[model samples]
Target: MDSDLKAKVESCARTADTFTRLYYASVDNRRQQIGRLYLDNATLSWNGNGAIGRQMIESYFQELPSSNHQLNTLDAQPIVDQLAYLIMASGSVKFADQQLRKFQQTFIVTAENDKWKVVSDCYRMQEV
Candidate 1:
């Protein structure tokens, strides 16, 4: 049974690795299309503010300047219930030529219709 979970975790690790890279690329360059990553009802709490629904979240993205994320750590675990992944990533990001800030983000990602979508996200900037 442990090995079963082990294999699943490994497989999902590959998926998560690919997904997150795709995600940040979309954030950095394809900012307008970032909404494609979210579920219809996805919720995001970004730097103490919140948005409900993908359109709203995409709109929120527009409010910010362009950003570049340099990932430092990426970790993920699989959840058996409804087959979701809990992903955590920490990194430094510079927004529109602003000073770099170390940040952390957590995501609950699920697969639906053969596509992975972000359902819950909490993003914050951390003090060093």
Candidate 2:
């Protein structure tokens, strides 16, 4: 790859890693900080329920039971000339009931004012 493309990929990869790390951490502990990672118009499709806007997204997460996540794999790439990127991650999570569940998550991250924020987020249980 060219130098410019390589740099974009590397930068986005780092951002993706940080985003995922903080995302799960927020879900597990810092629920209040979770809203900062998303834009005002961000959307989330959690399991099957869809929520739009940061308020709704944060509200949904706040109401969710506590969870512990163990990410197994993550992949990310720039999709729109460094302005946007796509991230995919698969992990196992143990909720309040202590039942471990496998899940796959996808996110569309966009750059705004030199910051990376999630524009769209979705996740579903992985069937074994």
Candidate 3:
């Protein structure tokens, strides 16, 4: 099952990458391709922040810009499973105002129709 585990980890990494890209896209007001990555009832919580429904989060993204977003990835640690997995990632968001904001995001993925899709995430900004 070593190969299987490796595959799962790799899949999680790709999904995490896509999620990070989507975050930047939203911030840049580029109309992030976010829906495709999340489940219908997914729960996303920001660290120490109140949790909101999926629709609320989606709507929030709909209002973000697409021109001022960038991600500086530091690392990803994946925990794999048959139907789900989680990836802990460290990164920074470069805003349009030329500010570097560090953050940590944990991505959770679930199997859907034999395909793995990121279902939820917990994110929080880090101090410099």
Candidate 4:
């Protein structure tokens, strides 16, 4: 009788927020660690270069241009059909240059073994 949908909403949102900070920072400072936060069947779409599986995604991240990222906005929403959170973030990422670029991303995250891991990532870059 401990079922409380509200509590799960709050919990999932906080989980999303926690990973927002951890995931991005890890990607920015520790590219090699990306796979650790991903499910084995995770899928990533970076600027339309789609990749499947955690290992493939890890390799894709290693090839990215070095960058520093700063967040501007964040959204964490729960999916009504599943035990998942839709985490969206917009930020500025400067890749090996002084020029800053705006980027938008959506991450579908779920919990397993009391840990959050990404299931799907859709990302895109904007113009100057």
Name the candidate that leads on lDDT: 1
Candidate 4 to truth, TM = 0.91
User: Model 2 over residues 1-106: C-alpha lDDT tens digits?
Assistant: 8899899899889999998998888788898788998999999998989999999999999888888888999999888634888999999988887668899999
lDDT (C-alpha, whole model) for all candidates: 0.91, 0.89, 0.62, 0.89
What tens-digit string does per-residue lDDT give for candidate 4 at 33-127? 88999999999998999999999999999998888888989888777673788899999988886688899999999888888899999999987
**Clash pairs of candidate 2?**
none
Instruction: Quote model 3's TM-score.
Output: 0.65
TM-score per candidate, in order? 0.94, 0.91, 0.65, 0.91
Give Cα distance to truth, residue 57, candidate 4, Å: 0.3
Candidate 2 deviant stretches above 4 angstroms: none
In model 1, residue pairs whose N, Cα or C atoms come closer than 3 Å (at least 3 residues apart or on different chains), thus clashing, are: none
Worst lDDT 10-window in candidate 1: 119-128
Write candidate 1's Cα lDDT for 67-107 as tens digits: 99988899999999558899999999988777778999999
Task: For candidate 2, report its TM-score.
Answer: 0.91
* Candidate rank order under TM-score: 1, 2, 4, 3
How much RMSD separates candidate 4 from the native structure?
A: 2.5
Instruction: Itemize residue pairs with steric clashes in candidate 4.
Output: none
Specify the highest-TM-score model's number: 1
Q: Candidate 1 local accuracy as lDDT?
A: 0.91
Q: List the RMSD of every prediction in angstroms.
A: 1.2, 1.6, 3.5, 2.5
